[PDB]
Amino acid sequence: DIQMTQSPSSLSASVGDRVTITCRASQGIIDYLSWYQQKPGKAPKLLISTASNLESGVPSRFSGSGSGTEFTLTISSLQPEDFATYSCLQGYTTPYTFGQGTKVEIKTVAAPSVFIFPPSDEQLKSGTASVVCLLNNFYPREAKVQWKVDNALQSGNSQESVTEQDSKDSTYSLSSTLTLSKADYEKHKVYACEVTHQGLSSPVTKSFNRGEC
Amino acid sequence: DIQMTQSPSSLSASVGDRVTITCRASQGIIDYLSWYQQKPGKAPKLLISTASNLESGVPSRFSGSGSGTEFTLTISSLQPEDFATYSCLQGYTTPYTFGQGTKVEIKTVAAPSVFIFPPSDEQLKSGTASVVCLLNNFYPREAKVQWKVDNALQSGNSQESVTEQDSKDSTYSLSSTLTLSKADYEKHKVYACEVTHQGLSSPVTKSFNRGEC
Amino acid sequence: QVQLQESGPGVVKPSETLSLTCAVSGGSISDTYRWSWIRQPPGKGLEWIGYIYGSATSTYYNPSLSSRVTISKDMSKNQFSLNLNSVTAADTAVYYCARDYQYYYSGSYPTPHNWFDVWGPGVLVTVSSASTKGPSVFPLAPSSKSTSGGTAALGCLVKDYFPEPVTVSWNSGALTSGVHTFPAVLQSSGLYSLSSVVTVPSSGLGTQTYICNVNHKPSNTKVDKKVEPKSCDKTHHHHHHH
Amino acid sequence: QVQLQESGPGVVKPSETLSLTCAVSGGSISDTYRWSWIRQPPGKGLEWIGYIYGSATSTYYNPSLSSRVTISKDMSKNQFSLNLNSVTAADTAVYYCARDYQYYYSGSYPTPHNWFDVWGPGVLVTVSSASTKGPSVFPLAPSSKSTSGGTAALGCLVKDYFPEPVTVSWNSGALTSGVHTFPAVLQSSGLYSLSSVVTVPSSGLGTQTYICNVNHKPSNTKVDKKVEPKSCDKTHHHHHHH
Amino acid sequence: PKLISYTLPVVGQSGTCITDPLLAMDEGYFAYSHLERIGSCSRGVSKQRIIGVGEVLDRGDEVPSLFMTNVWTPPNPNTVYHCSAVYNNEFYYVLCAVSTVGDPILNSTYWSGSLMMTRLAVKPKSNGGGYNQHQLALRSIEKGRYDKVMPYGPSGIKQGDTLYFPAVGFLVRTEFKYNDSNCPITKCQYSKPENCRLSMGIRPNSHYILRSGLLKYNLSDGENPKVVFIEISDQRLSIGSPSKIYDSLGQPVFYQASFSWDTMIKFGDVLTVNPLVVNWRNNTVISRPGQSQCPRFNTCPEICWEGVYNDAFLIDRINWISAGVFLDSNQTAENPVFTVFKDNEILYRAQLASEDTNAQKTITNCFLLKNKIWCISLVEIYDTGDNVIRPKLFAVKIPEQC
Amino acid sequence: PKLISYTLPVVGQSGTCITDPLLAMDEGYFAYSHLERIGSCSRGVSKQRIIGVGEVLDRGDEVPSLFMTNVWTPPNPNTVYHCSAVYNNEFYYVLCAVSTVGDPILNSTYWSGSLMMTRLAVKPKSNGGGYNQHQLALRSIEKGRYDKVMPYGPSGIKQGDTLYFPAVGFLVRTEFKYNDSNCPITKCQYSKPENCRLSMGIRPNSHYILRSGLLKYNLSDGENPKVVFIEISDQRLSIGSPSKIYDSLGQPVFYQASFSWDTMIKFGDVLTVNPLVVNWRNNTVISRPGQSQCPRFNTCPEICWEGVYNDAFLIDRINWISAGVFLDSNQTAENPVFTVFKDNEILYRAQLASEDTNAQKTITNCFLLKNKIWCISLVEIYDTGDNVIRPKLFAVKIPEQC
């Protein structure tokens, strides 16, 4: 098949920036490339057909260019509603192959509010104890939450969930869950989650103890 | 330098024949070749310049053609006043190299009259005895002569002299000299010259004895 | 305008056949030279499966799935189905049925530009062996360590539910500001579990009631809880009997 | 018209400076862009030696003779000379002086066709160590074996002379029919010798006077000799004294 | 192979691509047509449509090349489609299709079905105004059952005063009589017996069906000759495609592009011109790159309108040797290779460009340059430098020494 | 080294040889003039004298090539000598010499001293009678001290509206002033101090002396512009030879052929055009084959009018790298070799023909094809096949990767 490689896999820019998304073809197509916009939770929308046509209804700020192996999607005046995954598609031969998708975010620096929630007592009667570390309204998404117990590293028992960038304040919410058994729960004292973030000069550490209420 | 080789070295043809003289150059000269007619005993006369031009005064029967490496001197209607030495000359570079020369001969076959002359008495008194063998009005000029002395071939003591072809009957005269001393003269009796000629079916041998007058 | 709509079970056990159905409304599949299926695995890009003509029964399949995928027809019901058998955990995706479009120029050139102008909303097909389970949801009570610059958040933890999805509303949908419903994560036990928290000023704690309303329609489970900060004085009252 | 004329000694011993001179008549050496020397060894083809500009003093010489040949000049007497140093027996030739002619076409092409339009009469220069010597002329008397088809031949034998040439006239030049003055040859001793014989009817023997006049002007030699048939009866008259 | 295309007005700027080419050689004179667009080839604006006749002469190195003597351009490039060219008696007749509704193949139902025929002189005169360009009027198109008839294919032939432009006949699908038992689905199973009928038009539910054929234009009909459509026989019949009838070695050979399931090459000797009965070569080594459903070497009766025009010229009839440029690729239109092949084997080949060189419609014409079988092959090669399609000519001499 | 000689009418029959060629390239438009003789190149009868301008284009292999659109031939080829061609603003001005007394370099004393200029258009029109061919009249030739003046050399330059044809001025020998002490005879002994003065004309006793230079032809002088002769500076001065001033990399470069004892290549950047001051390159590796007295690599002051025209085009000025075709032989004018040389070493070379291939005047012009330095070299190669002279062109790409 004809492999479409997109670069970058995920870029971030502010409102009004000039965003160029490339889609390199493993095999040379003439101009049979199309560009799609996939909004979060929505069906993909055709933006550029034949690699150079602006479709009906899509704003003029979107522009596609290139033929042969190099194809570029250029957004002249980036807008708040142009923030979704962009995929290239080739119709030159079958099977049709899409690009891996280029996600676009909002370049607005912010600092997180580090929260930690001890497990509830009813959950302690349930059978398992999950400690959750909360990070609200930060940027960028790439951050590291390292689970340390009694100042001793714990790995392999952490699950992270980062929400999609909300359109209200253009930030992120992170929720890391430390799933552990009861025997492990009362065998340890300090349950702390470290936050290393671009907007925070120093690594902010939030912690709690079971014996302290 | 540029070697200028002719072919043939010496040709024979009758009056009114078409004679082609070829002069081959070692290197490639474009058309820088000249043809000269060297009459016997006279300075060469330019016939054809640039390998294709009939010079002023030269009869139209002389025609030259060819360029590059092969050059041709053509005498269309040969005449009795065209039996001389024909030389090619290259002017393309220096040193100017002539051809080895081409000799043109009258093709008229004739039979020689063989004569032999004993040495004179005052020649004997001088100390040497030179036997002279005479071949008058023969053709072709090239022949075969052997000194036979008492039925024994003698070599290393013969000197040959043949005139250039005449203009009255276009034939040749030959003369070989058997240079011998006095005591060498009286130590043999028979002194003969062997004649091999194209026009002579059998080898004519003229001989004389010392004791006969 | 042609409007597409996928339909099928959201959960498929490993090593059986997907049963998808793209009901075509607003137009008949007798037109539309090709009808395609496009899926997108979670976190990966779109990749194309195969097409069916609609007018004909001739199929093309992606060579990566050619030995597994089957695309059927029903002209009577105006829908085309998808049958992917022997599916593995790598076949979990969002399956879109798309209306294939071919742009022909200079009809001495039979090579058209191919794209999909009409797309279905897509359906999430999860390939797992776990059974449908109601969520067990545990509240996330705020504490003294849950404050940062005068703001204290709270929430509740959805644990061990399956399949997708859940809609967690707060105060019967009245609470909207600060609401963050995190995407679900697949545990080692095979059951989903997500978190749902809301940030409120620390001065409003103890005066307003916060409830998370978990709705799991695949299992018909309704979980309503009140969130209350952990008590700290009820355990240290030991009576000294003299 | 320009007439050339070579001049120089016909006798040059081995291993010294040959000294020729080409007087130019009918034209000036200031004209005639080049002036060349050409020699022709007997029995071999012409070869070129070198040229002098006349208007200039620049010389070019044949690379086979570049180390030996010197061509001088003279505006005063309108002649140019030749100086071949270390002459050997291989330098025996006829040395011609010639006007070198250049045919220029398309004077963006400075490569002319070079040939010699005017030649001198030439002069034979022989390299020999022998001194000038007068000829010795010995008769070739007719005999009974000197007859063929009613024709009897006779002649003169020129012997041991040097240098060229010798003019052998007969009966003060009265006899012209059948005259064959044979070319001379170089003997091992270095002295020239040629024959000079006549074909006459055998009936004319004893009734006509045949004398050869050999003229050798380099040694100032004049030889007049009669050819008479050998007597055959004057030796067998032995007297018997009783 | 030798590129020789330097003598033509083909080389435009980097923003204009050359589409819809033409090459038609007969008795030493060629013809060339091309539509220069602005921007993309598919969605660009048509700049000009050169329709230029010329001569095929010998350069100074025993290599033929194209030398245009006469060039004509229509006032409106947007209303000229699917030109076809035939030589006849020192004039060169080019018959195109006028269309104000787009491509007559694509927007066939609303097409006016009106043709124009433009004569051009191979040796134009100093003041031959009506001699050089005399656009003939076609007031009578004898179609028959076919609703619309269009010249569809680069080159045609002549017999004296009669011309035969390769054509296609728009027959209404309902009137097309085809027996589904004639659909050859014996060998493979994924082919319904009714694919031969639906694949016979552009869309399976299309209003029209394309049927290839010829356009008899008898010059001796008077002042207004008739353009009579002659349909092709039903033997090995598939969708109407840009055809090419050429007179090679005394008898016409009819190439007909494989724009359908029958991906094997479809060309052969012509038994008779009216009606058009073509003896298709039973060839199984030469095919064309189909895009999606009918790739190279597909014989199953399948519904598709895919492929590319890669004509083949019969260079020898005693052994049935033919030559042409073919894209040696299953699906992508790439790797143009000048092959010389029999009915069952490729004798030899010469790769014209790199392995992954995108190529397109190739037109191959062969002739004799002093009893030397040369071939000039117009190949559209995607120049990866300036990223445009530009028809490259290729003088290829057929070697008589192995 | 790629043959593009088929793009000019150099290929005739075996009885005609092409002599006195020309090639003048500027801004993508060239010129080409040649004299067709009958038989020998020296004594043959002149058939015609093509003078044809055109344009430089590209084929499918990125190889530049010539294409004459406009061709003019004088009614009497016997009276047109030593043409010089200069481009100026979509017109291509060709200045020649009218002579009824043969070549005026040879028969200079009897020459009429009359010139002719023939305007040709590199983009001819349909009916541009006076626009395509308009031979201008030159009724005012500003010579100065020179008795006669010639355009003598293939190509010149334009300075805005002003032309500069390579020229030569026939100054009478008696009024020519030259200090014999300036004759460089120090290094070698066979050179008199008076050889420089005498070798300055075609004969040591020639009535005239050839002094190369330029012909200022300003178009802003009115309806009858004046041909003003600009003599060359006396530094490194030798006989007037076919020169070539060409605008390379911004500043004109003046090649002046070595037709005399200074056999080393004599070309250099031009400091100022009027008066003409040429900073000759001190080159020690490039020379030309002289016939008899001044062979290749000769620097002694010698009286000779010998050599060939082998121009060199400056292809790099920061390194003073130039290119041209030179005959790699001492005396015989043969083995044309396309060499790229600096002032003191030959960088790389390409042998255009065999070792013993007789060659002649070579005209090398270089230019930019999409920012790539190509060179067209018109080499008069003697074809051993038909034993005549044919100018063979060679499109040579100057490589960047060694």
Residue numbers in the entry:
A (entry chain F), B (entry chain D): 1 to 213
C (entry chain E), D (entry chain C): 1 to 242
E (entry chain A), F (entry chain B): 200 to 601
Task: Copy the relevant paper text.
The Nipah (NiV) and Hendra (HeV) viruses are nonsegmented single-stranded RNA viruses belonging to the genus Henipavirus of the Paramyxoviridae family. HNV cell entry is a complex multistep process involving the binding of G to host receptors, the activation and structural rearrangement of F, membrane fusion, and the release of the viral genome. Because of their critical role in viral invasion, G and F are major targets for developing therapeutic monoclonal antibodies (mAbs).
We observed two dominant antibody-antigen complex types during data processing, each containing two heads with intact high-density. These complexes differed significantly in the flexibility of the overall architecture and thus were designated the loose or compact types. However, the flowability in the spatial position of the mobile heads made them weakly resolved, and we finally determined the incomplete 1E5/G-tetramer structures of the upper heads of the loose type or the lower heads of the compact type at resolutions of 2.94 Å and 3.18 Å, respectively. In contrast, in another type, the observable 1E5 binds to the lower two heads at an angle approximately parallel to the stalk to form a pseudo-symmetrical structure with a relatively small overall change in the G-tetramer. When superimposed with the corresponding two protomers of previously reported G-tetramer, the compact type manifested a high degree of coincidence, while the loose type exhibited a moderate difference. We analyzed the structure of the intact G-tetramer ectodomain using the receptor-like bnAb 1E5 and found that the binding of 1E5 induced the G-tetramer to produce two dynamic structures. However, given that the lower two heads are close to the membrane under natural conditions, it may be difficult for the entire 1E5 to access the downward epitope due to steric hindrance.
